[PDB]
């Protein structure tokens, strides 16, 4: 103590960000990874306020960038998942260890290191150790070193508002915070059909105009990023949305009207001439459709424990079935209304939601062709549910897996909700107590799926207190090579299903494996053929005379 | 919402007795006295887990 300095140097933090970003600088004539970052930075960080903003898929353009440049490209794109609290430099240091130490990969490597949400109290040392101090250092093993010509990226999401301050930071936000000071499209997804056939029809559906001529010429038509988000945010509903919601939208969007084109229900209205002004029922039934599905919305648990809605919810329902070239409509029915209209109701109560969708000769139209509207699944037997079921579901010559198993209409709700759920793309997450049925319920959709065929379909993972992240990549890992097992010898779908997954540390690594399609950095096949199902337990507080 | 759960209860003590020779009868007594057990547990004002 008696070698105090009371004085506390310090600097301003212009000249901390100025000294880093000149001393960051890799020069010309080096042939590195930085050509495609902000002028030979070599070190980015790229952080945002909320999640599902876009910071993978920049890193993933900057990968591409670099691809496009610089022939030959071959180049790696290392991906370090780091997903536990009191954070380990050992982890790290042992997932960068086989990597450049073989002198062939001397060749330009964008590095990319992921710290999640749960990594509360080890941050700043690891940044200060890789980013500024160029080391990770074994006691009794090996030292690392950084390199000028290695690009490196960090995540964070967001104390830490000053410290993340100093390096060369790229911020991003969410599409209501680009649209007011700034395109916001990923160009190569706009040139994909996914959001290029939406917009076809949304362009078509917001100033009025007739859906009888044919869409789709397989190219991309005139339009920008910025009228199209705008539609996005128009037709979406929710006021803040980020850019997963906007995403799972247009390709929920996407299966439907691919579902609509794939019947002969266009066919059909070309050769009667009298059924037309269904596509603008359709594409406005999808919006309610959509807004069912993909929009939400203690002072701790807030985020948390505030549900917004529950299942004593109408969810009105509709599919088209794939084979056969009829519909159907479950949960919701159809009465008259006076101004010479129809409107929609939920059973059980008198709500006169969404008015004046669509006229008469539509019903005249489809009570001529005979599809199954406006019957209530109170009073069918067991054969003639199951058969709505097969025709819903695509199943063709069903058999009945298990007469035990009650049969609900939310116990059908849920069924197909869950079935469009992993067939259109969206992550499918529970939220449920321990007294619902939902184990029963997945095993009641693959037993149904499966229909005769004794392999395995339904694999149970349980994740208990204890559950290390690396259990989880090796059933994740066991369940691809069984799903490969299965389409190829039966040409079957597997399920695979996490119970309670909300208990570990490893909730991240659960996000991992199925919002975005990757596991321990390596991208899962979309062709393979596997749906990964999650579920929590619901966040609550105990009564206070059972803490007395 | 407990209109379905004795149909529950009597499906799993129906499936889980194997009461081939027990009762024809009884299993309804067990059914409902498991029913106004769960009932019991509603109505109070916290549960065990
Ligand atoms: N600018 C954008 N334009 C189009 N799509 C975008 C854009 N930004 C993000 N997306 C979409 O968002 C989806 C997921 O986003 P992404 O994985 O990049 O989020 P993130 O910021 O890494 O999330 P998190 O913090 O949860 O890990 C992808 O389908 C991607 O196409
Ligand atoms: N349709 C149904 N018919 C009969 N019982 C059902 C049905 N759906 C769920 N159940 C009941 O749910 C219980 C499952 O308990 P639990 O293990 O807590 O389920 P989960 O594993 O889904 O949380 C079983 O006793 C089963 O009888
Ligand atoms: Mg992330």
């Known amino acids: 103590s008696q070698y105090k300095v009371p004085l506390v140097p310090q600097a301003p933090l212009p000249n901390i960000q100025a000294y880093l970003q000149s001393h960051y600088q890799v020069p010309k004539r080096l042939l590195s990874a930085a050509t495609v970052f902000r002028d030979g930075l070599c070190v980015g960080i790229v952080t945002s306020e909320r999640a599902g903003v876009g910071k993978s898929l920049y890193v993933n353009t900057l990968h591409t960038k670099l691809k496009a440049k610089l022939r030959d490209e071959t180049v790696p794109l290392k991906i370090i998942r780091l997903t536990e609290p009191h954070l380990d430099e050992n982890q790290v240091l042992s997932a960068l260890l086989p990597f450049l130490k073989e002198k062939y990969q001397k060749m330009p490597v964008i590095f990319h290191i992921d710290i999640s949400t749960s990594v509360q109290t080890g941050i700043p040392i690891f940044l200060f150790k890789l980013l500024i101090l160029q080391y990770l250092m074994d006691i009794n093993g090996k030292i690392w070193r950084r390199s000028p010509g290695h690009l490196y990226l960090v995540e964070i999401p967001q104390p830490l508002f000053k410290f993340l301050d100093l390096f060369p930071k790229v911020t991003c936000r969410p599409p209501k915070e680009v649209i007011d000071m700034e395109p916001a499209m990923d160009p190569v997804e706009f040139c994909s059909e996914a959001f290029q056939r939406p917009y076809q029809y949304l362009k078509r559906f917001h100033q009025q105009q007739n859906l009888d001529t044919f869409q789709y010429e397989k190219g991309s038509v005139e339009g920008s990023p910025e009228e199209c988000l705008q539609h996005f945010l128009i037709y979406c509903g929710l006021i803040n949305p980020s850019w997963s919601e906007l995403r799972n939208f247009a390709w929920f969007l996407n299966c439907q009207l691919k579902d609509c084109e794939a019947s002969i229900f266009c066919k059909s209205a070309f050769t009667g001439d009298t059924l037309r002004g269904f596509k603008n029922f359709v594409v406005t039934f999808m919006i309610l459709m959509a807004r069912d599905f993909a929009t939400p919305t203690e002072e701790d648990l807030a985020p948390f424990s505030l549900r917004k809605r529950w299942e004593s919810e109408p969810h009105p329902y509709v599919f088209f079935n794939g084979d056969h070239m009829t519909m159907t409509f479950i949960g919701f029915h159809l009465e008259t209304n006076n101004n010479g209209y129809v409107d929609a109701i939920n059973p059980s109560n008198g709500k006169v939601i969404k008015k004046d969708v669509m006229t008469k000769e539509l019903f005249d139209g489809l009570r001529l062709q005979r599809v199954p509207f406006n019957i209530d699944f109170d009073n069918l037997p067991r054969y003639e549910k199951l058969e709505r079921l097969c025709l819903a579901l695509g199943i063709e010559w069903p058999i009945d897996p298990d007469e035990t198993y009650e049969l609900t209409t939310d116990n059908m709700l849920k069924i197909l909700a869950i079935e469009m759920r992993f067939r259109c793309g969206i992550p499918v997450i529970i939220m449920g107590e321990t007294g619902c049925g939902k184990t029963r319920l997945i095993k009641f959709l693959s037993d149904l799926k499966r229909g005769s065929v004794e392999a395995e379909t339904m694999k149970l993972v349980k994740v208990h207190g204890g559950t290390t992240p690396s259990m989880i990549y090796s059933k994740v890992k066991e369940a691809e090579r069984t799903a490969f097992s299965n389409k190829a010898q039966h040409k079957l779908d597997t399920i695979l299903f996490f119970d309670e997954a909300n208990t570990t540390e490893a909730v991240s690594c659960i996000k991992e494996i199925l919002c975005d399609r990757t596991v321990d950095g390596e991208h899962l096949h979309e062709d393979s053929g596997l749906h990964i199902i999650a579920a929590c337990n619901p966040y609550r507080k105990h009564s206070q005379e059972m803490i007395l | ?49």
């Open chain 2, 1 to 49: 919402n407990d209109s379905a759960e004795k149909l529950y209860i009597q499906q799993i003590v129906q499936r889980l007795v194997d009461s081939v020779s027990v009762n024809p009868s009884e299993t309804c007594v067990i059914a409902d006295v498991l029913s106004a057990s769960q009932m019991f547990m509603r109505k109070r004002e916290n549960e065990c887990g």
